[PDB]
Coordinates of N, CA, C and O and ligand atoms in Angstrom, one line a residue:
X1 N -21.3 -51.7 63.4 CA -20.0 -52.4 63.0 C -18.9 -51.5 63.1 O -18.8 -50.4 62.5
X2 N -17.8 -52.0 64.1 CA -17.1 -50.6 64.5 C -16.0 -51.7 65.0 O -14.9 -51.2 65.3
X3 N -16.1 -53.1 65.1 CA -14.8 -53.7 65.8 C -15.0 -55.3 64.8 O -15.9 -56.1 64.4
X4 N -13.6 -55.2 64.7 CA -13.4 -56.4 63.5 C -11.9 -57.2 64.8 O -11.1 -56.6 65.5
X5 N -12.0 -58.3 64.6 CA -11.0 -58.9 65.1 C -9.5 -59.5 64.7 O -9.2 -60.0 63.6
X6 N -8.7 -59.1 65.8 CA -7.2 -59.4 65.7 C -7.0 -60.6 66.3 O -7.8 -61.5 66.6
X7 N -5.5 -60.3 66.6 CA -4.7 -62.0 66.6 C -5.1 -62.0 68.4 O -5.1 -61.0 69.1
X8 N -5.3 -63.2 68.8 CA -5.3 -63.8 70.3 C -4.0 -64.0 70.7 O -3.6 -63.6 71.8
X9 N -3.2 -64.5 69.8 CA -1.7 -64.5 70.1 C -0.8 -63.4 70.7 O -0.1 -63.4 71.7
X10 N -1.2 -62.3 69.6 CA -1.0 -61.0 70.1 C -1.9 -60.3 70.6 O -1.5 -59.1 70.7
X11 N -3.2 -60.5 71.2 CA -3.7 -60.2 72.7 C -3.2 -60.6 73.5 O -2.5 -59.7 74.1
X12 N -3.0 -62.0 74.0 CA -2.4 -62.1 74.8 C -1.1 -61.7 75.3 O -0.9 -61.3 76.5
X13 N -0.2 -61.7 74.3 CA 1.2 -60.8 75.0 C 1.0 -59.6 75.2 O 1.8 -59.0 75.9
X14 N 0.0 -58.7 74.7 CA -0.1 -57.4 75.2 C -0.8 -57.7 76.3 O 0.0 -57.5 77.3
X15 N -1.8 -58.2 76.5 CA -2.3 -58.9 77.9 C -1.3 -58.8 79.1 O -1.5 -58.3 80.2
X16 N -0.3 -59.3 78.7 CA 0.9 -59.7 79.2 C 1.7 -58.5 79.8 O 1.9 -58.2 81.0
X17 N 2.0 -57.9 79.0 CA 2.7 -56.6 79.2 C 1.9 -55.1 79.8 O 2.3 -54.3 80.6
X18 N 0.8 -55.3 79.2 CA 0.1 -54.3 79.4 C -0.7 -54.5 80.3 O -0.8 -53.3 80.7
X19 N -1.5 -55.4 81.0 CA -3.0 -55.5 82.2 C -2.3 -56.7 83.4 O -3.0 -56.7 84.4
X20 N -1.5 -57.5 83.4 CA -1.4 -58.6 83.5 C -0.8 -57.9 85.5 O -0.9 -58.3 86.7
X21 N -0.2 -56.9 85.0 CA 0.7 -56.0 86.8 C -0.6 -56.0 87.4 O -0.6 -56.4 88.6
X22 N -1.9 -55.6 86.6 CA -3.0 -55.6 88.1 C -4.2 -56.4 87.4 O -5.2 -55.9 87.9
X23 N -4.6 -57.5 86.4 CA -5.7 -58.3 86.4 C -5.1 -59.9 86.0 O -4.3 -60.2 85.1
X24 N -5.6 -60.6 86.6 CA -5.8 -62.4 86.1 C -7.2 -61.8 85.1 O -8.0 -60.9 85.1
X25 N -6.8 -63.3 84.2 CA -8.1 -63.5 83.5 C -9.0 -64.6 83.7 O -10.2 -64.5 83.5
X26 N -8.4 -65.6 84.0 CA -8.8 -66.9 84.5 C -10.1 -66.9 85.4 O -10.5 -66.0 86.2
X27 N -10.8 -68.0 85.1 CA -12.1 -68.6 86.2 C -11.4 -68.8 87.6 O -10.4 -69.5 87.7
X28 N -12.0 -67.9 88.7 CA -11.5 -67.9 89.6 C -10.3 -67.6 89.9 O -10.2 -67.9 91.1
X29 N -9.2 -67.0 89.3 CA -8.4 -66.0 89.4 C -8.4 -65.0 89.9 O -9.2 -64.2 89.4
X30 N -7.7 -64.6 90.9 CA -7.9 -63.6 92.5 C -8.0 -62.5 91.6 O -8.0 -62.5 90.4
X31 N -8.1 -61.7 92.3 CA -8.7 -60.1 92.4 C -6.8 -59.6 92.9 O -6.0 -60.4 93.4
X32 N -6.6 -58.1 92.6 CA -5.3 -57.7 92.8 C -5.7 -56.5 92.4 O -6.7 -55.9 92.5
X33 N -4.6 -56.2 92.1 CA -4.9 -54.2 91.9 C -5.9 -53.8 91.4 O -6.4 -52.8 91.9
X34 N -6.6 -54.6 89.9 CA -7.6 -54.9 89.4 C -8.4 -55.8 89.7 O -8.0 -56.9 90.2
X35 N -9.6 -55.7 89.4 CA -10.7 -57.0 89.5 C -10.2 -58.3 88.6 O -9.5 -58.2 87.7
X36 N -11.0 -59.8 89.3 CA -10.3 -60.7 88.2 C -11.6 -60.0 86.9 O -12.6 -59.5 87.3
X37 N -11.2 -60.2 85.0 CA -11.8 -60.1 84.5 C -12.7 -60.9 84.0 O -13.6 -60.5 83.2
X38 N -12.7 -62.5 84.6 CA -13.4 -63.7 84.0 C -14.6 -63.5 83.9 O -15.0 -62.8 84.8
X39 N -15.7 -63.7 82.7 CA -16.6 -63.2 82.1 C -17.3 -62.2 82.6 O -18.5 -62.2 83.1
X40 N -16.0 -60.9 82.3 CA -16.5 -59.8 81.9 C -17.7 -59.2 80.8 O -18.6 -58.4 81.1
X41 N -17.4 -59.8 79.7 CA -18.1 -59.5 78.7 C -19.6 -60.1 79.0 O -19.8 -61.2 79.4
X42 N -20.5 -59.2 78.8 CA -22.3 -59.2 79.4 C -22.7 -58.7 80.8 O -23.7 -58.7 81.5
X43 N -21.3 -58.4 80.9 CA -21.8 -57.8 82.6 C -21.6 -56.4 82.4 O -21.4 -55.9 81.3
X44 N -21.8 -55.7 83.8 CA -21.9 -54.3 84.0 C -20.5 -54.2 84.5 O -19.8 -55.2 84.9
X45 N -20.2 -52.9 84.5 CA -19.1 -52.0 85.2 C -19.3 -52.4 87.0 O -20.5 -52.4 87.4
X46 N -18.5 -52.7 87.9 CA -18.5 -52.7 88.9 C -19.4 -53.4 89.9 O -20.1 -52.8 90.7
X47 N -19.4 -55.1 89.7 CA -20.2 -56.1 89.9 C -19.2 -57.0 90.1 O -19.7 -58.1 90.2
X48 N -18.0 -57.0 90.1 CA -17.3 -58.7 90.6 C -17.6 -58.4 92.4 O -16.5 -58.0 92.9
X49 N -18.0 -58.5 92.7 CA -18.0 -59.1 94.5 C -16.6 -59.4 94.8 O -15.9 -60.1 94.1
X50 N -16.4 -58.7 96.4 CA -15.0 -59.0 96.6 C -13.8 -57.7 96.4 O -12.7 -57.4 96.9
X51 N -14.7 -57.2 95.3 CA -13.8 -56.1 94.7 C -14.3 -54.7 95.1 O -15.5 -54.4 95.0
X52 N -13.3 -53.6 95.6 CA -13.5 -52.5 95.9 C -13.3 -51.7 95.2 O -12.2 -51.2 95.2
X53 N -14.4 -51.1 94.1 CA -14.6 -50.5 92.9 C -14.9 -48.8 93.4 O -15.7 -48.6 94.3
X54 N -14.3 -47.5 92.7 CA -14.7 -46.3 92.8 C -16.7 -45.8 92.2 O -17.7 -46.2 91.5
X55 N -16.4 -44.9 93.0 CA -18.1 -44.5 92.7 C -18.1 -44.1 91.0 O -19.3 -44.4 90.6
X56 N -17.7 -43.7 90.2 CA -16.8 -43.8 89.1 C -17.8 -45.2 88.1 O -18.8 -45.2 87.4
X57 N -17.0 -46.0 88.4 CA -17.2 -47.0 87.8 C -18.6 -47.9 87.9 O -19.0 -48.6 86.9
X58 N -19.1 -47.9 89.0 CA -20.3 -48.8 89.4 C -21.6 -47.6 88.4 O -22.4 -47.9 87.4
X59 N -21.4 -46.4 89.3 CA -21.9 -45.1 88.4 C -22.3 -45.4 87.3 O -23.5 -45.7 87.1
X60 N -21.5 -45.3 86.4 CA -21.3 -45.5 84.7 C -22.3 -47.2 84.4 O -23.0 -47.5 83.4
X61 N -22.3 -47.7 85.0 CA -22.8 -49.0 84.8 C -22.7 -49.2 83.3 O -23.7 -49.3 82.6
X62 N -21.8 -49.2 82.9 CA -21.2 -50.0 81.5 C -21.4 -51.6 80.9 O -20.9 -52.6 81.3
X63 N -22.1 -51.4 79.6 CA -22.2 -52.8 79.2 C -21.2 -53.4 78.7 O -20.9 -53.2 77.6
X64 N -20.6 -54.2 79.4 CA -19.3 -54.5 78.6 C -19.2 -56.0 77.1 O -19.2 -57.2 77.0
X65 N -19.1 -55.0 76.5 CA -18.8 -55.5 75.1 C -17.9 -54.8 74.5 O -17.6 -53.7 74.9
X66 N -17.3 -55.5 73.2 CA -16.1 -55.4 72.6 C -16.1 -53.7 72.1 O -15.1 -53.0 72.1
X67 N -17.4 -53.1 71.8 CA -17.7 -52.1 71.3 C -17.1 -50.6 72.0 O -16.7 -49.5 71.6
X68 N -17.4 -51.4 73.5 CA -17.4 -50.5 74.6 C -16.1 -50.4 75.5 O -15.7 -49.4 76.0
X69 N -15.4 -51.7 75.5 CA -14.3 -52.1 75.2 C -13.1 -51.4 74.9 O -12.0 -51.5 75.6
X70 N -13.3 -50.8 73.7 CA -12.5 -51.0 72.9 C -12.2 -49.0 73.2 O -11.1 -48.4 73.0
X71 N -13.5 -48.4 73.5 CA -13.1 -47.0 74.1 C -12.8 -47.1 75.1 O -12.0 -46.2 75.5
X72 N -13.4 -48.2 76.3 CA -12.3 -47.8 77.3 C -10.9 -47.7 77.5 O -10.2 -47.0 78.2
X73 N -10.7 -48.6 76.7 CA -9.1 -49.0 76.5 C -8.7 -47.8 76.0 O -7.9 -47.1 76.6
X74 N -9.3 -47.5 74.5 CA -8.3 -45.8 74.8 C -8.2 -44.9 75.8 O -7.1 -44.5 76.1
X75 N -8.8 -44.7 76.2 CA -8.5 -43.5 77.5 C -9.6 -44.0 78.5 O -10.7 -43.6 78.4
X76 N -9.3 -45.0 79.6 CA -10.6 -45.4 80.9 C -10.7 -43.4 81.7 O -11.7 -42.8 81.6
X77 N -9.9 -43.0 82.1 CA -9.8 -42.1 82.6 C -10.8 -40.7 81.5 O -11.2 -39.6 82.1
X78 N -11.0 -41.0 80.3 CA -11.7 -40.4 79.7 C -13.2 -40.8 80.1 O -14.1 -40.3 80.7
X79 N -13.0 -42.3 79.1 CA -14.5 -43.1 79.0 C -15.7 -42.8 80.3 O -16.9 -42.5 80.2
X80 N -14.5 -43.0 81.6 CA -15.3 -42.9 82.7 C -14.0 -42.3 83.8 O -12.9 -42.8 84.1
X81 N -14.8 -40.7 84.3 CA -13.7 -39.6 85.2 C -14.2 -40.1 86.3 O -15.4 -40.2 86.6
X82 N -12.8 -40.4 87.0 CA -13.1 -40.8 88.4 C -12.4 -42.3 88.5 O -11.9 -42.6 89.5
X83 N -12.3 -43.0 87.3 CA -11.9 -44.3 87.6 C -10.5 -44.9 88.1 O -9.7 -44.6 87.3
X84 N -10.1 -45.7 89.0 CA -9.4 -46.0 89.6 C -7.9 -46.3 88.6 O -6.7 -46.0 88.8
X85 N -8.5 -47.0 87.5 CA -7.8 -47.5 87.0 C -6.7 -46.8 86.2 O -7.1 -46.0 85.2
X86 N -5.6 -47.0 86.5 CA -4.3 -46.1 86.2 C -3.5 -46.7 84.9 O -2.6 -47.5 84.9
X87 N -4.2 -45.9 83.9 CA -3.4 -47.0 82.2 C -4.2 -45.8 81.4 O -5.3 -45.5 81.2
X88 N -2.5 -45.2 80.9 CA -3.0 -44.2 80.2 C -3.7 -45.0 78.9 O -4.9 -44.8 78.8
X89 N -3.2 -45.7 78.1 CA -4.3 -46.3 76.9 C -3.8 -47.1 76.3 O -2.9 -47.7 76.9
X90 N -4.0 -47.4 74.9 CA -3.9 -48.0 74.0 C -5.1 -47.3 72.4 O -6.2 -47.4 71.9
X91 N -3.8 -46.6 72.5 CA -4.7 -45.5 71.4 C -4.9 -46.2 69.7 O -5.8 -46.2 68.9
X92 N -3.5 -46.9 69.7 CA -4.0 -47.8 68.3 C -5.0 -49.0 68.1 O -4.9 -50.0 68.9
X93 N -5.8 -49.1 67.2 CA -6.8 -49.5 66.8 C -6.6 -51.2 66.8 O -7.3 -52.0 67.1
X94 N -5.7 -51.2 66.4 CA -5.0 -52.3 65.8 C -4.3 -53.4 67.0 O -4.3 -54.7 66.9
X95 N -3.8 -52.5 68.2 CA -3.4 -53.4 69.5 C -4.8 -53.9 70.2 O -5.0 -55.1 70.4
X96 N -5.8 -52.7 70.5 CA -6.8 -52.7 71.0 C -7.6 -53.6 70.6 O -8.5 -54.0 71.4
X97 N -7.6 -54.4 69.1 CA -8.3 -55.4 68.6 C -7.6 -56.7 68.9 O -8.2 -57.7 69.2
X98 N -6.4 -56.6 68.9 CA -5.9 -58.0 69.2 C -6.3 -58.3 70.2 O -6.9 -59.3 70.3
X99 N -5.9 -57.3 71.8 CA -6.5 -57.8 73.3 C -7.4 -58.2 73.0 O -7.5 -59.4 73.0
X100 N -8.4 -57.3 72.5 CA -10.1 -58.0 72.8 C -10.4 -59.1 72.1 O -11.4 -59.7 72.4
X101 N -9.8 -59.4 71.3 CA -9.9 -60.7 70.6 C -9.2 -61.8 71.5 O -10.0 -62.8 71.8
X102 N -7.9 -61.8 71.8 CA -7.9 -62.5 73.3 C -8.6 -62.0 74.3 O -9.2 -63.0 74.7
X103 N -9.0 -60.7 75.0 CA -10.3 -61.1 76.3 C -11.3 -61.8 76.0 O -11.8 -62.6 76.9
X104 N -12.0 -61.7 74.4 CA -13.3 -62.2 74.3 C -13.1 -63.4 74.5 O -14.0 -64.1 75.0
X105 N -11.7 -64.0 74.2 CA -11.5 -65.5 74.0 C -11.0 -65.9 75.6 O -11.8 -66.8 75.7
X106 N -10.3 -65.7 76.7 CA -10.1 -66.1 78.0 C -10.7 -65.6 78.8 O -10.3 -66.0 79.9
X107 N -12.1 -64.3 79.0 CA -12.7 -64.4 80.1 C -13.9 -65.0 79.8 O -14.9 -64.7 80.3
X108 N -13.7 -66.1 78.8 CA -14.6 -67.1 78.3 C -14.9 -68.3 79.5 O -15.6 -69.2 79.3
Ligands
LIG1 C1 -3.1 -51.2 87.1 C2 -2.0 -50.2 87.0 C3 -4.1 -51.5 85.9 C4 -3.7 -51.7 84.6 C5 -2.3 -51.6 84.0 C6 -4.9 -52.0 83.9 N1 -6.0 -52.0 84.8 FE1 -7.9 -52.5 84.4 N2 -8.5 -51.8 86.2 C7 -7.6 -51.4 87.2 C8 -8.5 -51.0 88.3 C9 -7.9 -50.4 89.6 C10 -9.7 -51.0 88.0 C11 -10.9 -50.6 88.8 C12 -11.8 -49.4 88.4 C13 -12.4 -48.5 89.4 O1 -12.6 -47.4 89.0 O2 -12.8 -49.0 90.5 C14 -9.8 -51.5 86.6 C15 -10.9 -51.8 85.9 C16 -10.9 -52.5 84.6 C17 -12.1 -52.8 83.8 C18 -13.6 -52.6 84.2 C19 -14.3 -53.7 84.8 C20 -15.4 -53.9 85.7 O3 -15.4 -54.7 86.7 O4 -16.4 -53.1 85.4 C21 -11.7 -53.4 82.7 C22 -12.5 -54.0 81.5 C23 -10.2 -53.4 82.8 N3 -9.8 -52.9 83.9 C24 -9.5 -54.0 81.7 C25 -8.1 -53.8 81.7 C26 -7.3 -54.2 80.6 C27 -7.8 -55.2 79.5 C28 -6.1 -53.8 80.8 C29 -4.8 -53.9 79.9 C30 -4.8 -53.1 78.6 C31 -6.1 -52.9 82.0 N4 -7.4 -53.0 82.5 C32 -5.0 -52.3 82.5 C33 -6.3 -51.6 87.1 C34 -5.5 -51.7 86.0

């Protein structure tokens, strides 16, 4: 027990501001600087097809859940060296809950 849930409302606009320059979240929502994330959550690290992921990432084969989540978001460039993805973080606890409370809820 290590992640408790925030507002969707306010996932989403950080969604917005913060992931939105390189990911869709949507069913079938293209691929762009980022992979699309549509049900992310129960998959592994570096498995959307289509997408040209670093050795980094597939590597790590990550289960993605909110748990796991929730440290990448602080530092991906920590979680996993090597990874493409260029976003220094979201070090508060408190932002990082609201996204994932909106991802859990739209790559539904
Ligand atoms: C562009 C400047 C990005 C921003 C801002 C965010 N992400 Fe991203 N993400 C980006 C890339 C290029 C990659 C690929 C990684 C690689 O090393 O090949 C990623 C990856 C992810 C993943 C992992 C998914 C997987 O398929 O295993 C996640 C969960 C992810 N990104 C989420 C995410 C969120 C929620 C963001 C906003 C806070 C965000 N990323 C920022 C590109 C960019």
């Amino acid at each position: 027990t290590e992640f408790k849930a925030g507002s969707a409302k306010k996932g989403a606009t950080l969604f917005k501001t913060r992931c939105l320059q390189c990911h869709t979240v949507e069913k079938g929502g293209p691929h762009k600087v980022g992979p699309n994330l549509h049900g992310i959550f129960g998959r592994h690290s570096g498995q959307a097809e289509g997408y040209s992921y670093t050795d980094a990432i597939i590597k790590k084969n990550v289960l993605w859940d909110e748990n796991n989540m929730s440290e990448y978001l602080t530092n991906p460039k920590k979680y996993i060296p090597g990874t493409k993805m260029a976003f220094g973080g979201l070090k508060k606890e408190k932002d990082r809950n609201d996204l994932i409370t909106y991802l859990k809820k739209a790559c539904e």
